[PDB]
Amino acid sequence: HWGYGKHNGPEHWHKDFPIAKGERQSPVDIDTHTAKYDPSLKPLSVSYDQATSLRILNNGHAFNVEFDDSQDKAVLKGGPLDGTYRLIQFHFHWGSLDGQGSEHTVDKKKYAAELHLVHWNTKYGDFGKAVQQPDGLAVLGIFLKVGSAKPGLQKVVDVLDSIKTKGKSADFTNFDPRGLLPESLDYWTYPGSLTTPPLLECVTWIVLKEPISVSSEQVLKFRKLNFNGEGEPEELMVDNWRPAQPLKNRQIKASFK
Ligand SMILES: O=C(O)c1cc(O)ccc1O
Numbered sequence: 001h002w003g004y005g006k007h008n009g010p011e012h013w014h015k016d017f018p019i020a021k022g023e024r025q026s027p028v029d030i031d032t033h034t035a036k037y038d039p040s041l042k043p044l045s046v047s048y049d050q051a052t053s054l055r056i057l058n059n060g061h062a063f064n065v066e067f068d069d070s071q072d073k074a075v076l077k078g079g080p081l082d083g084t085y086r087l088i089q090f091h092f093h094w095g096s097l098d099g100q101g102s103e104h105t106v107d108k109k110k111y112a113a114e115l116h117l118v119h120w121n122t123k124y125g126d127f128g129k130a131v132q133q134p135d136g137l138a139v140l141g142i143f144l145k146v147g148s149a150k151p152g153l154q155k156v157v158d159v160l161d162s163i164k165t166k167g168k169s170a171d172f173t174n175f176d177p178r179g180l181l182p183e184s185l186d187y188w189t190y191p192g193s194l195t196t197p198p199l200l201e202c203v204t205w206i207v208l209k210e211p212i213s214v215s216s217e218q219v220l221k222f223r224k225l226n227f228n229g230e231g232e233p234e235e236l237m238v239d240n241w242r243p244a245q246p247l248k249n250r251q252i253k254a255s256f257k
């Protein structure tokens, strides 16, 4: 099945998922000079005070922090979005080295990692119906650079030893995703896709300009995770990023002047 290796990585995905070569694939490179400020963007609203985390799962590709999305509780709205999108999970992509790891790039610059907070449009009832729609999802993308530690990430780092291998999960209640956000909500936005199979073209991407800093020790613990299952040969979970895809007939808009 699919993965990030030589024989099952991003260059092979198109054979099972032809949309890999579609008209609005993600990630992309963000050319900061070509992005245009958009005065029609409404203020972005990230409302995570009642977020209710449940569980953290190693899915053999990344790890997901999963949320209870059964009530109206952790929502993203405003900016380019019409209506209200509800948080369902977050996950990361990261490298084997600090020089690479992010999926989006900024003027071809790769950050050490990238955080994706995934939300579905509540007009569609749940995530499964949302991913049948061109505006079903919104992903808030946040770059990570290596420098000072991010204190709000440490509860994630410390639980990773308990989910080292594919299929393992752990209770992960009361985690506050507000502690993962940078100061500024300045962002770039464009229409694109999920960045793993099935690569569905449902996503309004909102990529924050300001990275968060995490420590070298925090990212090193991400790289101790495994893609393999328990009792299988070790294949460290590193370089679980898809490279930038063709922009095609898209424009990237900036929320800032
Ligand atoms: O993601 C995978 O399944 C994978 C498998 C490999 O054999 C080597 C690197 C990988 O990232």
Ligand SMILES: O=C(O)c1cc(O)ccc1O
Pocket (backbone or CB within 6 Å): 116, 118, 194, 195, 196, 197, 198
């Ligand atoms: O971001 C992704 O690639 C993604 C893929 C899925 O199949 C489900 C949720 C996701 O967020």
Ligand SMILES: [Zn+2]
Pocket (backbone or CB within 6 Å): 091, 092, 093, 116, 195
């Ligand atoms: Zn992702």
